[PDB]
Design a protein around this ligand. Structure first.
Ligand code: ADP
Ligand code: ADP
Lengths: 286, 284
C-alpha cells in the first residue's frame, strides 16, 4: 500500500501511515506565478494500492485532489482509493431552489470517475453516497469519541437539534449513559426550546455532540440555555471542527471545553480517528 | 439562445450578449460562512442553447465553472456550450517529470463530460484540444488585433520567441507588414539573441505579439534588446494579460504601450474579441 498525504490532512495522514508502518507520501507542491497549482509525486507508485488522504472543502483542496488524481495516472497502480476525512459540499446535496447546483453530486461524480473507492468520516447526509458510481463508505468517529469520554464524568449525551440522534444514541449506549435532544424553533421572533425527553439538567454533566461546528450558533445557544438551567459541566464535541467567525469563543462563553477530531486539524483536535481509517484501509487491503 | 456570464468574464460576456441582442445571464453568487461557493441561476433555461462564458484559470474560476455545469442541469436544455476566453492549465498539457498531473487533460475531461462543446481563444498548445470528448474549438484573436493596429504606424510585427510564429505571420500578412522573431537562448549564464531574419530595427517601430503575459520577463527582455538596437517605438500586445505583480512595470521600462484583449480584463484591455466569439456562437 501507498498512503498519499495531502496538505489539508498531514496530521491525520501521518498518524495513519505510522500505524500502518508506511510512508506518508507528500507531494512537492507550489503555485506558479499566475496562481495555478503545481504538484508532483516522484515516488514509484506502480503496482500498489493507493490511498489518497485529503479534505475536499476549500477551492484549493478540490484542486489538490483533482490534480493528484491526474498525477497518479502516470503509474500503473493496482487501485486508487480516496479518503476525504471531511467531505466538502455535503450540505448542498440537493437543489433547494431552482437553478441551484447539487454541488455534492457533481463533485462526487468527478471523484468517482477517477477512483476505485471513496470514503469519508461522518458525512452530512448519506444521500451523497448515492451520487458515487464507486463504493462510497461513511466511516464513523463514534468509537473514538467514546474512547475519549469513557474517562470523563458525563451524565447525559445531548444532541443540539432533533437530527444527529442516531449518533448520540450510539455514543451514549457505548458510554452507558442516557441521552436527550434539544429542539429549537423560532416562532415570531421568539425562540422556543424543548428538551426531549424533558431531562432535569440541574447539577448534571452534559456532553453535547454534533457532526460539524461551523458558525456554532445552535451549539452556543443550547449551551447557554443548559447552563442557565443549572448544568454543572458542559463538554462540546463534534467530528469536524471548522470554527468559522469566532464560533469556538461563542461556544466557550457557556461551555467548559471543546474537543473535536483530527478530520479538520486545529488546537481543539484531541480525538484522533486514525484507527477507524486504518481499519477501513486494511479492509480494502494492501 | 442563452448567454451565461460568469464573474471572470462579465465585460466580454456583456459585449457578446449585446451584439447578439440577448441577456447576459449572471448567477446570484456568494460564499457560505465556511468558504464554500454558492451559485444560482433562477432564469428558465429549458429548451435553449446555453453558452457559458468564463475563464478557467483560478481555483475559484474552476469551482464557478463546475458548479455552473451542475446548476444548469436543473433545466432540460437544448445544448450546453462552454466558452472559456482564457483556458487555464493549458501550459501543463503533458507530464514534464514523472508523477506530475496532465492538468489540462483531466480538467478538459471534466468539462467535456458535462457539455456538448468547448471553445477558447488562442489556447497555449493545441495538444489540449485532443483531450476533449466533445468538439473543442480554438478561436483566434488575430482579426481583432489587426483591426486595432490598422490605425497605428508599424514597421515590423515581431514574435518574442520561435513559437508564436504562425500568429505573427498571419497578423503581419493582414496588416501588410514584414515580420521577424527573436531567438533568445542562455549559454553559460550569458544571454545570446538572434533576429530571424536579421532585420535592422534601427529607427523602426515594432509591434511585439505573444499569447500570454504572466511575469512579463520574456516580453520585457526582448523589448529591451530591441530598444538598445535602436527601435524608435515598441508596442507590446498579447491575447491574455495576466500581469502578475511586477510585470507591467518591467514591460514599460522599454516598451511604449501595452494593449491586450478582454479575455482577461485589465486596464490594458483595449482590444475586444467579442466579434470572434459571436461568429463561433452564430455557427455552433
Ligand atoms: N457550506 C454550507 N454552509 C451553510 N449552508 C449551506 C452550505 N451548503 C449548502 N447550504 C445550505 O443549507 C441548506 C440546507 O440545510 P438543511 O436546513 O439542513 O436542509 P437539509 O435537511 O436538506 O440538509 C440549503 O439551503 C443549502 O443551500
Ligand atoms: N501556469 C503555469 N505557469 C508557468 N509555468 C507552467 C504553468 N503550467 C505549467 N508550467 C510549466 O511550463 C513548462 C513547459 O514550458 P516549455 O518549457 O515552453 O515547454 P512547452 O513547449 O511544452 O510549453 C513545464 O515545466 C510546465 O510544468
Amino acid at each position: 500500500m501507498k498512503i498519499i498525504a495531502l496538505r489539508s490532512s498531514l496530521k491525520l495522514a501521518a498518524r495513519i501511515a505510522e500505524e500502518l508502518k508506511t510512508e506518508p507520501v507528500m507531494p512537492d507542491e507550489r503555485r506558479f506565478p499566475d496562481g495555478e497549482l503545481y504538484l508532483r509525486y516522484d515516488e514509484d507508485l506502480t503496482g500498489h494500492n493507493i490511498f489518497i488522504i485529503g479534505n475536499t472543502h476549500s477551492d484549493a483542496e478540490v484542486m489538490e485532489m483533482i490534480l493528484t488524481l491526474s498525477a497518479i495516472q502516470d503509474y500503473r497502480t493496482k487501485s486508487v482509493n480516496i479518503i476525504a476525512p471531511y467531505y466538502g459540499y455535503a450540505r448542498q446535496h440537493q437543489r433547494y431552489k431552482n437553478g441551484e447546483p447539487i454541488s455534492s453530486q457533481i463533485l462526487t461524480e468527478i471523484y468517482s470517475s477517477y477512483s476505485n473507492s471513496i470514503a469519508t468520516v461522518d458525512i452530512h447526509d448519506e444521500k451523497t453516497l448515492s451520487y458515487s458510481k464507486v463504493k462510497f463508505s461513511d466511516l464513523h468517529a463514534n468509537d473514538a469519541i467514546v474512547r475519549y469520554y469513557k474517562n470523563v464524568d458525563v451524565d447525559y449525551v445531548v444532541s443540539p437539534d432533533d437530527g444527529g440522534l442516531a449518533r448520540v444514541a450510539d455514543i451514549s449506549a457505548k458510554l452507558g449513559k442516557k441521552h436527550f435532544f434539544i429542539e429549537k424553533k423560532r416562532i415570531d421572533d421568539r425562540t422556543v426550546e424543548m428538551k426531549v425527553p424533558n431531562v432535569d439538567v440541574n447539577g448534571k454533566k452534559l456532553l453535547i455532540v454534533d457532526d460539524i461546528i461551523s458558525t456554532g450558533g445552535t451549539i452556543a445557544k443550547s449551551s447557554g440555555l443548559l447552563r442557565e438551567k443549572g448544568a454543572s459541566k458542559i463538554y462540546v464535541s463534534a467530528v469536524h471542527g471548522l470554527f468559522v467567525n469566532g464560533s469556538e469563543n461563542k461556544i466557550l462563553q457557556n461551555a467548559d471545553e471543546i474537543h473535536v477530531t483530527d478530520t479538520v486539524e486545529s488546537k481543539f483536535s484531541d480525538i484522533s480517528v486514525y484507527q477507524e481509517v486504518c481499519n477501513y484501509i486494511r479492509d480494502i487491503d494492501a
